[PDB]
Amino acid sequence: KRVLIKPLEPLMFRSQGEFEPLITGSHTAAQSLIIPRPSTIAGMLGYILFNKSSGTGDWLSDLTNLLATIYGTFIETNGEYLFPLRMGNHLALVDQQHLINLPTLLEKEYERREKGIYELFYDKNKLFQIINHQDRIGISIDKSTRTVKEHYLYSARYLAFKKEVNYVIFIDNDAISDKINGKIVNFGGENRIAKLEVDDYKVDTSIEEEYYLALSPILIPDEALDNFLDNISDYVAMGKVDKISLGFDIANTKRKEMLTAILEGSIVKRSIIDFIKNEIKNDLRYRFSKYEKIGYNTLMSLCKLALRKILS
Amino acid sequence: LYEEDYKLALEAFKKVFNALTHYGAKQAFRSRARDLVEEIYNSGFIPTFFYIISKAELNSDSLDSLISLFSSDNAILRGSDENVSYSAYLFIILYYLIKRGIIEQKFLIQALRCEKTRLDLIDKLYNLAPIISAKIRTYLLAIKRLSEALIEAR
Amino acid sequence: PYYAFAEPFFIHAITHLHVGSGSSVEEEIDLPFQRDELGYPTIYASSLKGAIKSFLLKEFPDKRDVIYKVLGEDENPEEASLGTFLDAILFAIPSRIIEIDSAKPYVWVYVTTYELLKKVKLYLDSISQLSNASFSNLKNKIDTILAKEGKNITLDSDLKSAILNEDFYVELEALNNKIPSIINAGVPLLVLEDSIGREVINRSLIRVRRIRIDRDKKVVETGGLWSEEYVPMKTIFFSVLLGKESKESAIFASCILRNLRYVILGGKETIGKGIVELRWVKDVI
Amino acid sequence: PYYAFAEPFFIHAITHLHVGSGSSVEEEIDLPFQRDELGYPTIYASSLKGAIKSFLLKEFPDKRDVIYKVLGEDENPEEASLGTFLDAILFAIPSRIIEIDSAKPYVWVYVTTYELLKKVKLYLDSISQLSNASFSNLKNKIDTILAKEGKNITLDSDLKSAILNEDFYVELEALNNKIPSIINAGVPLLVLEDSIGREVINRSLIRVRRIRIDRDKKVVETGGLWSEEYVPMKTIFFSVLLGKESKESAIFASCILRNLRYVILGGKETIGKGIVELRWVKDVI
Amino acid sequence: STQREYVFIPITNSITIDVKITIGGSDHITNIDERGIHNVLVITGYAVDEKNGRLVPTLDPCDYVKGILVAGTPQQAQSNDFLTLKLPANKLYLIRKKGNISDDLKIYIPYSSPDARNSMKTKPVSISDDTIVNNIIKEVFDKIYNITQKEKVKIEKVKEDIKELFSYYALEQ
Amino acid sequence: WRKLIEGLRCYSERKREDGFWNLVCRVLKLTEDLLQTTPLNIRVKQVSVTEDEIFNNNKLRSDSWKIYDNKYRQLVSEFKKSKLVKVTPESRLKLFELTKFDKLPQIGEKSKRGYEFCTSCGVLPAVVIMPKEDELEKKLIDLGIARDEKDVRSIKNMISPGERLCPWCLVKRALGAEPRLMRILLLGDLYSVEKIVNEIVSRDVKIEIPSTSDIASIKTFEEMIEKKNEICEDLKEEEVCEKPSESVLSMWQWFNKNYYNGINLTIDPEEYWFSEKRRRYYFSVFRRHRITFPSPYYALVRADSDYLGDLLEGKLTPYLAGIIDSGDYANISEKKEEVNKLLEEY
Ligand SMILES: [Zn+2]
């Protein structure tokens, strides 16, 4: 039911693309996401569960045939759980006990709101006690001069883990356990390695509250984008909205689609569930249903570890 | 580990720095801080300890002025410029064995009075020779640096 | 699984090492070693693979394609690689020792901490599920040591007291009574607490100043002074080489890996700062 | 074949030498000698190279381009150098001896330890594998001394008892009485056990206090006293010079290295503390 | 049901036990198991009155009190100033989840009448207090969990937890 | 944003020739729908007042003197309230079908792997992909990029080989080749867009902007600028001793300030001391003339005042920075002893 992904060494999940030497008189550089996107985690299990007799040009019609349904990802150090929390470009790894009073916090008076929010991302933010940015710098050597090439230098801020950390997901499938278990995986990045571990864990499947946490990017179907962005306060209480690419598919070596999403760790109001349903058309509902299977539209209650969905 | 030894080196020095009224005794101490620290780690601790006490010329009011320096701040070291300096460095070494609990303070203070017990002090330090030499290093090296800095020629 | 096998190995510094990292850390070192998440020296997987791949292409120039299939094909062709190195993890650093007769006398000893031995265990557990050449003879030893966590430990020697690096007095306890040592060198291995070990280890790291001299007046230039950090001789880094299932890796693991004894990692080879030795924990166990 | 040529050489001190402090660890001596990882004296190859380089750029002005090739350019490097120096391991130090009784009395002897011979064997084994060379003559010698490890031995002479450096009494076994000396010397070589050898060696080092006198009072200046550490005369170090195929490595090994006998290493040259003699293993056999 | 009483850990003098009842059975919810305390529960919307050390109730979801769940009966002495609950597991909002619960229990919490006399004001306060932190080592938990203070997991493992886990809003009234 | 895309379209067709504009024309037309969206995405707020809050009958009321303070208070709060949600301007774009199906207009190379993110942004896909330095001419002119060869040295002048560009970033590069086009926004509703463009094509102003390689060469330029005659004979042909052949200008009040010491501060240092085919040369050139070889490092200095917006609220945090923090104003009584000592003093 529950899958722990144990990184054996610093990882890198880069966004923003174009990490390779193209321009002559210039270095390259890449950062890393603190939490891997669900496309990354889906592609990892899809890599284990791969049979050539499938797909032929799909990468999600092909992917959704392998895994049943994945739920969003968070952190687990020592049996504690930490969850992404996002603000106006600030990201924090906050503990479960601090999300309870967010809806009352986001509604307080001006000065009492800022103080409460400020202390969440600075004092009660447990990210930097758990994760450090190891800014590795690499180099390409030409065997002719046996020195560095013309500006073939790159900086890659890896994801160093000060403590023991796992990424936590849940799968609807149970025939999946004895397949992806104890497996050494090439957890997406610069050829890095993590270990997989499956154990049972009972959590809710569907709930109703007035404020959810986005435990995974909530994809916006690019057709409601106008009727959604013009009135954003009706849907997102706090967090970050931006255009993201869904990744890079292996079987075709192509960058996946690029569509606006609500980044994981945002606080979405209940108004976001019905809005999506009443804006997504069945032309794409069959598509966005798959996007949910790999783990994108995953919501969490600020109460407790209860995992909802949007189209499900 | 030895982060509080740079502190200890500052209270021990400020004591020795004040119980050295004569200017030529400070200069003579600056000579001991440089030299004595470099024989403890080439010749050994107790070979240098024997050399220190032999030049310190104990068994006087000096040997009791030391006992006062452990607590009082008005004590003074009187004697030959070469004696006060060598005896002031004996304080430095003993002040550390007290504050760090390597040697019991009550033993050391009564071994510095009872003539019959001083041999038992030297006998105790012989077995604590490896342990002591390791710990005093940061402390003595700091005393060496403070001497070269604070003890100046007029 | 596409990680059919895993070949852990020990990286044994024949000379001092310097795998550089720019100017990433503070202490006073201008050219420091490559660190890890908690401050110990490591060899990054990029530097360890690139050095072994730059080597071994001059050594076996006929097998350049076998190496390209496994180690990357640095050319514009971008078929996926078949072999992965994990970051080399500091396993044991040499330390000067003065023991109070305490023994058959030693002058130097191997020193580990419990933080370092957890990451080694982490690497060891992670590949036990695919290594059907199960090296539990080694994984168990770390397990018993980690059970005794919370005090300074000597594995096979019987010292009970020593002075490490002329500055730190520690009292040691046998594992339970005895156990075979990992490194077959006739040298004890101490496992210290993480606070005391981090000071003893930082004292074995070589931090030198270096000088550029005005050749006409034989004096140092202006700003011709800088500082570097080396990892001593006899240091031991532990890493793993993971291989996907293929026919090239069968050649690579049989024909190529048997003949790697000495390679050169890091930089400053002119100073002779890269000669290192791999030991392939499948015969030392 | 990774290295074109491989040139091990001994470094006999003609005068007391002093390679400067370098390190960052605070120490009692004001200007200490360069230390090993075991604490023995050594010469960082960065100091071997810079000194030998500037010596050759004077004694061979016409071949100033062959030297820039093998030992790297100075001001604007396009390319890495081809030659490497390994850090000079301490091989043997002289120690005055009070020989209790024997047919031939001795006034001083060479003292070496088993830990030092192991580092030399590490150099010889790796350089043997990373090159065409095979120093089986040395290796067969040192691998016989390292078999008697853990026991004070005199190499050829018959001593059985002695007082080294006026403070240490040792009893010595005889190894074979047939194996030839490592170096060309009538002076015997004692391979001490590493524990007693560390203390015997620290006695051979030369600690020296120096002053700066005020010219107008003929007294020491204000704080113008400092200490200083020298390695004795007749001390033998051991390093290796390595090189890759470049058509200048062949010239280097032919002229430059075959006309190098005396160099000035280290500092304090105005007081004669640097003159040293290089004996190539191709010759001392 | 099991008579599981939930006791505060504020900065107050009267915090000693105020319950002369103990395990009684052999069961408990919070455990110190080679990681630190387990299954700590949070009472939100409640405060603590400095005098008369008890959980003062409020309606602000921000005000909160954190304690442990021990199976001792509520002192068998007051029976008035205590809130008595018949509650399942899924409604016990707990921290450090290790083991689930029998999912129907009976809990007593140190209560207080609202005391509508004066206007409320609840203050955030910590309980680090290194001079006091040593009291809590053997004030509350060891008297329930003596097994850990003697020949098992260290009681310094509990120290960096209570200066980390418990931090309650007070009244200053 | 529209009136700037308008002028950029007009101006680029005015210079339909000359290279790098037949390219800008080809993308300002291929990506009309994308360039509709402003890339900056401001946010507006508003409060209001009434006669009730300020008057009694026709004169000011008591406590009215605090209306403006309280009204500006709500305005500030409404901003900080909305700053909780960060919506990047790229999210407004519609790129789903342009990347799932290869409908993205890619002038230049064809992405072997999808769509090739921009090299400036990193977020948006690129429209103008650029070939590497295998060779440009035989790879520029065959592809649609270059119509001929003469335009190549004019395209390279504005776009580096290998550099991918998105529609927004090319607009940054196009305006970077002609900054006077900003007059469209500067004046506004004063001149018709065409009249603005006309004065730009009715002149030849050349505004050269420094680069990070120029800033890393000040002390070198300023050294060979006072050792001119000596450093001059040896080169005589390397554009270092070229004579200013134009009257170009810059906002950089150091380039303008010299520009007139026969030194030609226009030379790209990456074809010089910062190059690879010419590094050792100018090392030797600088060697003989006691000119120190330059360092590749500059300093990016960024100043910002502390608690200024917090000062506009009349608060005291800029005074007692750290002793009282912005969070303290949720309850000022906790710092009553200090906030009064200052206020009483003011
Ligand atoms: Zn862009």
**CA pair distance F181, F15, nearest whole angstrom:** 13
Per-residue CA distances from C39 to C25, C36, C145, C194, C227 (Å): 9, 5, 22, 12, 18
Torsion from C-alpha of F54, F56, F61, F64, nearest 10 degrees: -20
C199 interfacial to chain B (CB closer than 8 Å): yes
HSE on the CB side for B24, CA within 13 Å? 6
Whether D78 and F280 lie within 8 Å, measured CB to CB: yes
Is residue A88 helix, strand or coil?
A: coil
- In DSSP terms, which residues pair with C97 in a beta bridge? C164
If we measure between CA atoms, which residue out of C55, B37, F100 comes closest to residue A245?
A: F100
Q: Is F166 annotated as a binding residue?
A: yes
Contact B129, B142 (CB under 8 A): no
Contact F328, F321 (CB under 8 A): no
Question: A142-175 as b/e, with b when 16 or more CB fall inside 10 Å?
Answer: eeeeeeeeebebbebbbbbbeeebbbbbbbeeee
d(CA F170, ligand 1 centre) in Å: 8
Phi-psi region of D117 (alpha: psi -120 to 50; beta: other; left: phi over 0): alpha
Question: F20-41 as b/e, with b when 16 or more CB fall inside 10 Å?
Answer: bbbbbbbbbebbeebbebebee
Length of chain D: 285
If we measure between CA atoms, which residue out of C212, C233, C215, C232 comes closest to residue C223?
A: C212
Contact C89, C119 (CB under 8 A): yes
Whether D57 and C215 lie within 8 Å, measured CB to CB: yes
Q: Is F232 annotated as a binding residue?
A: no
Residues on chain D touching A147 (C-beta within 8 angstroms): 77-80
**CA pair distance D9, E98, nearest whole angstrom:** 66
Whether C22 and A137 lie within 8 Å, measured CB to CB: yes
If we measure between CA atoms, which residue out of A106, A131, A127 comes closest to residue A116?
A: A106
- Residue F152 is inside which H or E element, if any? helix F152-155
DSSP state of D88: B
Q: Which long-range contacts (CB under 8 A, 24 or more apart) does D72-78 make?
A: D72/C270, D74/C215, D75/F283, D75/F287, D76/F279, D76/F280, D76/F283, D76/F284, D76/F287, D76/F293, D77/A147, D78/A145, D78/A147, D78/F280
DSSP state of D28: S
Q: Which residues contact A148 (CB under 8 A, 6 or more apart)?
A: A139, A140, A141, A142
Closest CB from A16, A17, A22 relative to F162: A22
How close, in Å, is residue C98 to chain A by CA atoms? Answer: 33
Write the DSSP assignment of C43-54 as a string of letters. Answer: E-HHHHHHHHHH
Residues on chain B touching C201 (C-beta within 8 angstroms): none
Q: In chain B, how many domains are there?
A: 1
- Residue E92 one-letter amino acid: L
Here the tokens at position C276 are 């290192």
By C-alpha distance, the chain F residue nearest D77 is: F280
Would strands E105-110 and E3-8 be described as parallel, antiparallel, or unpaired?
Answer: parallel
**CA pair distance A74, A95, nearest whole angstrom:** 10
**CA pair distance A247, A255, nearest whole angstrom:** 6
Phi first, then psi, for residue C232 (nearest 5°) are -65, 165
Here the tokens at position E164 are 């980390």
Contact A220, A259 (CB under 8 A): yes
| Dihedral sign for Cα atoms in the order C24, C27, C28, C33 | negative
Phi first, then psi, for residue C26 (nearest 5°) are -95, -40
**CA pair distance D47, F166, nearest whole angstrom:** 54
Here the tokens at position E93 are 């909002």
Whether C167 and B137 lie within 8 Å, measured CB to CB: yes
Contact C56, C63 (CB under 8 A): no
Write the DSSP assignment of C116-133 as a string of letters. Answer: HHHHHHHHHHHHHTT-SS
Residues on chain D touching B134 (C-beta within 8 angstroms): none
Whether F280 and D75 lie within 8 Å, measured CB to CB: no
HSE on the CB side for D272, CA within 13 Å? 5
- Residue C10 one-letter amino acid: F
DSSP state of E32: B
Write the DSSP assignment of A25-37 as a string of letters. Answer: T--EEE---SS--
DSSP state of E50: S
- In DSSP terms, which residues pair with F225 in a beta bridge? none
Closest CB from C44, C122, C130 relative to A8: C122
- In DSSP terms, which residues pair with D277 in a beta bridge? D12, D262
Is residue E80 helix, strand or coil?
A: coil
Torsion from C-alpha of C124, C126, C129, C133, nearest 10 degrees: -30
Domain membership of residue B80 as a residue range: 3-150
**CA pair distance C83, D270, nearest whole angstrom:** 57
Contact A87, A183 (CB under 8 A): no
Phi first, then psi, for residue A23 (nearest 5°) are -80, 145
Here the tokens at position D164 are 């080294």
Contact D85, D267 (CB under 8 A): no
How close, in Å, is residue A163 to chain E by CA atoms? Answer: 14
By C-alpha distance, the chain B residue nearest D204 is: B42
Here the tokens at position D272 are 């004669």
Q: Is F241 annotated as a binding residue?
A: no
If we measure between CA atoms, which residue out of A304, A1, A16, A40 comes closest to residue A186?
A: A40
Contact B60, B35 (CB under 8 A): no
Largest CA distance in chain C: 65
Per-residue CA distances from E100 to E89, E95, E96, E103, E129 (Å): 7, 12, 11, 8, 33
- In DSSP terms, which residues pair with E5 in a beta bridge? E70, E108
F122 interfacial to chain A (CB closer than 8 Å): yes
DSSP state of D252: I
Whether F92 and A111 lie within 8 Å, measured CB to CB: no
- Residue A5 is inside which H or E element, if any? strand A2-7
**CA pair distance C235, C89, nearest whole angstrom:** 11
**CA pair distance D227, E152, nearest whole angstrom:** 54
Structural resolution in Å: 2.8
Three-state helix/strand/coil letters over C164-211: ECCCEEECCEECCCCCCCCCCCCCCEEEECHHHHHHHHHHHCEEEEEE
Is residue B116 helix, strand or coil?
A: helix
**CA pair distance A115, F330, nearest whole angstrom:** 7
Residue position matching structure tokens 């280097």: D252
If we measure between CA atoms, which residue out of A219, A260, A271 comes closest to residue A72?
A: A219
Three-state helix/strand/coil letters over C103-117: CCCCCEEEEEEHHHH
Contact E137, E155 (CB under 8 A): yes
What is the CATH number for B40? 1.10.520.30
E97 interfacial to chain A (CB closer than 8 Å): yes
Is residue F331 helix, strand or coil?
A: coil
Residue position matching structure tokens 């010491």: F261
C166 interfacial to chain B (CB closer than 8 Å): yes
Contact B69, B19 (CB under 8 A): yes
Q: Which long-range contacts (CB under 8 A, 24 or more apart) does B2-11 make?
A: B2/B135, B2/B138, B2/B139, B2/C167, B5/B138, B5/B139, B5/B142, B6/B138, B6/B142, B8/B95, B8/B96, B8/B99, B8/B100, B8/B139, B9/B139, B9/B142, B9/B143, B9/B146, B10/B146
**CA pair distance A105, F330, nearest whole angstrom:** 13
Whether C37 and A132 lie within 8 Å, measured CB to CB: yes
- Residue B144 one-letter amino acid: K
**CA pair distance E141, E153, nearest whole angstrom:** 13
| Dihedral sign for Cα atoms in the order C173, C175, C178, C179 | negative
A133 interfacial to chain C (CB closer than 8 Å): no
Is residue F309 helix, strand or coil?
A: helix
Q: Is F304 annotated as a binding residue?
A: yes
Would strands C275-278 and C83-85 be described as parallel, antiparallel, or unpaired?
Answer: unpaired
Here the tokens at position C16 are 């001092």
**Residues in chain A whose Cβ is within 8 Å of chain E:** 78-80, 96-97, 100-101, 104-105, 116, 202, 303-304
- Residue A92 is inside which H or E element, if any? strand A91-95
Phi-psi region of C180 (alpha: psi -120 to 50; beta: other; left: phi over 0): beta
Would strands A166-171 and A2-7 be described as parallel, antiparallel, or unpaired?
Answer: antiparallel
If we measure between CA atoms, which residue out of E109, E108, E104 comes closest to residue E1?
A: E104
Phi first, then psi, for residue B46 (nearest 5°) are -70, -35
Residue position matching structure tokens 């160093």: A160
Whether D28 and B41 lie within 8 Å, measured CB to CB: yes
Here the tokens at position D51 are 């000194």
- Residue B9 is inside which H or E element, if any? helix B5-18
Contact C121, C138 (CB under 8 A): no
If we measure between CA atoms, which residue out of C88, C91, C89 comes closest to residue C112?
A: C91
Is residue F96 helix, strand or coil?
A: helix
**CA pair distance D256, D258, nearest whole angstrom:** 6
Give the Cβ contact number of residue A130 at 10 Å: 17
State the angle between helix axes of B129-150 and B81-99 in degrees (0 to 180), rounded to the nearest 10.
130
Q: Which long-range contacts (CB under 8 A, 24 or more apart) does D71-74 make?
A: D71/C270, D72/C270, D74/C215
**CA pair distance E87, E97, nearest whole angstrom:** 18
Is residue F67 helix, strand or coil?
A: helix
Question: C60-99 as b/e, with b when 16 or more CB fall inside 10 Å?
Answer: eeebeebbbbbbbbeeeeeeebbbbbbbbbbbbbbbbbbb
**CA pair distance C71, C68, nearest whole angstrom:** 5
